[PDB]
């Protein structure tokens, strides 16, 4: 009989679901509770996880025929990887499908803070056109951008802000060579503190690890300029959200723009919603039609590979492959 696939959340483009349905039977859940996942996972061979939905260890353990878990994008913080590896279940992500889209969105957010764009749009529409008399937009030319995490997106962001705006770009990333920054005109710094002291804009593009977990706390905001801005499009847990709220109240920084949150989705009464110079979007930086199509096709094709016994291109737990063999033959 045809294998079953569980979609914990739809894909961002249904070209991926169409591909899955060529050879599997799928069931789609919509923001399901842990029990709904436990009911629907028992006989599936493949699972797709739309961020920020979570797949805990207890759910993976009930799935006796599971072969592969696919995430919606790069991040895997909603998968229990240890549990999958213990069971011989292959975990794949879909990286670098939204690189252009997030760099565009980050540039848009950097520019919107500098020009107070949403605040000013709200002022004109309410009748306070004459707020212009006390407004002083920032000219981005020759200001300094600090990139934390110089990977696919961070490097593109450094490239664009150079070409588009004439900004000086500094980067902090211990795991990449200095030459990677020079190629796009940036300077790789060994000391994050230097980047924090020199930057007028600080943009986050790291992977979420135990080192980047809550990297940006009150200690780090104290080191940034009072005039400076934070932008986070990477992961919510990189920023202590409670510390960010204190930092804004105490004028440690001037504002921020966030596409990611912790917890995500954010609560209805999040105190960040009442702050001057705060710009939010609901994890849409990497969700353009182009990026959604590419990541959907990628996730669907990888799920099909593992069902066939074929090694996929984006295994994140390759040490689990032999135990997968053990169970798949």
Residues that bind ligand NAD (CB under 6 A): 73-75, 95-96, 98-99, 102, 148-154, 172-176, 205-209, 211-212, 233-235, 259-260, 283, 285-287
Residue 197 in the binding site for a second copy (CB under 8 A): no
Tokens of 175: 């795991």
Task: Choose, by CB under 8 A, the member of 129, 183, 197, 250 that binds a second copy.
Answer: 129
- In this structure, are residues 45 and 4 in contact, taking their beta carbons and an 8 Å threshold? yes
Displacement of CA 135 from its chain's centroid (Å)? 33
Q: How many CA atoms lie within 13 A of 240 on its CB side?
A: 13
Q: Which residues contact 131 (CB under 8 A, 6 or more apart)?
A: 120, 123
Q: Is the peptide bond before 277 cis (omega within 30 degrees of 0)?
A: no
Q: Nearest-CA neighbor of 203 among 161, 266, 265?
A: 161
CB of 126 to a second copy, least distance (A): 8
Please return the burial class of 150, using the count of CB atoms within 10 Å of its CB with bins 0-12, 13-18 and 19+: buried
- In the chain, breaks (C-N over 2.5 A) are found after none
Residue 14 in the binding site for a second copy (CB under 8 A): no
Q: Nearest-CA neighbor of 157 among 109, 119, 193, 219?
A: 109
CB of 90 to a second copy, least distance (A): 28
Strand partners, 315: 92
Residue 96 in the binding site for a second copy (CB under 8 A): no
Task: Choose, by CB under 8 A, the member of 23, 34, 43, 124 that binds a second copy.
Answer: 124
Pick the closer one to ligand NAD by CB: 172 or 229.
Answer: 172
Residues annotated as catalytic are 235, 264, 283
Pick the closer one to a second copy by CB: 108 or 301.
Answer: 108
Pick the closer one to ligand NAD by CB: 74 or 324.
Answer: 74
| The entry of ligand NAD, a second copy, none that residue 152 binds, CB within 5 to 8 Å by partner kind | ligand NAD
Residue 136 in the binding site for a second copy (CB under 8 A): yes
Strand partners, 146: 170, 202
Positions that interact with a second copy (CB under 8 A): 12, 100-101, 104-105, 107-109, 111-112, 114-115, 117-118, 120-125, 127, 129-132, 135-141, 159-160, 163-166, 265-268, 273, 279-284, 287-292
């Amino acid at each position: 009989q045809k294998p079953r696939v569980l979609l914990i959340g739809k894909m961002y483009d249904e070209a991926g679901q169409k591909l899955l349905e060529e050879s599997t039977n799928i069931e789609i859940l919509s923001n399901p509770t842990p029990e709904e996942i436990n009911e629907a996972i028992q006989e599936v061979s493949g699972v797709f996880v739309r961020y920020p939905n979570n797949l805990e260890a207890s759910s993976i353990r009930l799935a006796k025929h599971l072969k592969v878990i696919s995430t919606s994008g790069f991040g895997t913080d909603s998968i229990d990887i240890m549990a999958a590896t213990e069971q011989g279940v292959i975990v794949v992500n879909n990286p670098g499908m939204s690189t252009t889209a997030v760099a565009e969105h980050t540039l848009s957010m950097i520019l919107a803070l500098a020009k107070k764009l949403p605040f000013l749009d709200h002022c004109v529409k309410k009748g306070n056109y004459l707020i212009r008399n006390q407004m002083q937009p920032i000219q981005l030319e020759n200001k300094t951008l600090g990139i934390v995490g110089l990977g696919r997106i961070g490097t593109l962001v450094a490239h664009k802000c150079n070409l588009a705006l004439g900004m000086r770009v500094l980067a902090y990333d211990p795991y990449v060579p200095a030459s990677k920054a020079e190629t796009v005109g940036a300077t790789l710094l060994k000391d994050l503190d230097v980047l924090l002291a020199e930057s007028d804009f600080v943009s986050l593009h790291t992977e979420l690890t135990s080192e980047t977990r809550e990297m940006f706390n009150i200690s780090v905001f104290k080191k940034m300029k009072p005039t400076a801005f934070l932008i986070n499009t990477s992961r919510g847990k990189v920023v202590c959200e409670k510390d960010l709220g204190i930092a804004l109240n105490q004028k440690l920084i001037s504002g921020c723009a966030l596409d990611v949150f912790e917890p995500e989705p954010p609560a209805l009464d999040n105190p960040l919603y009442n702050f001057e110079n705060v710009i939010l979007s609901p994890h849409l930086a990497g969700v353009t039609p182009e990026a959604s199509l590419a990541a959907a096709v990628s996730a669907a094709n990888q799920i099909l590979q593992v069902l066939r016994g074929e090694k996929p291109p984006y295994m994140i737990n390759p040490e689990a492959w032999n135990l997968f063999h053990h169970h798949h033959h």
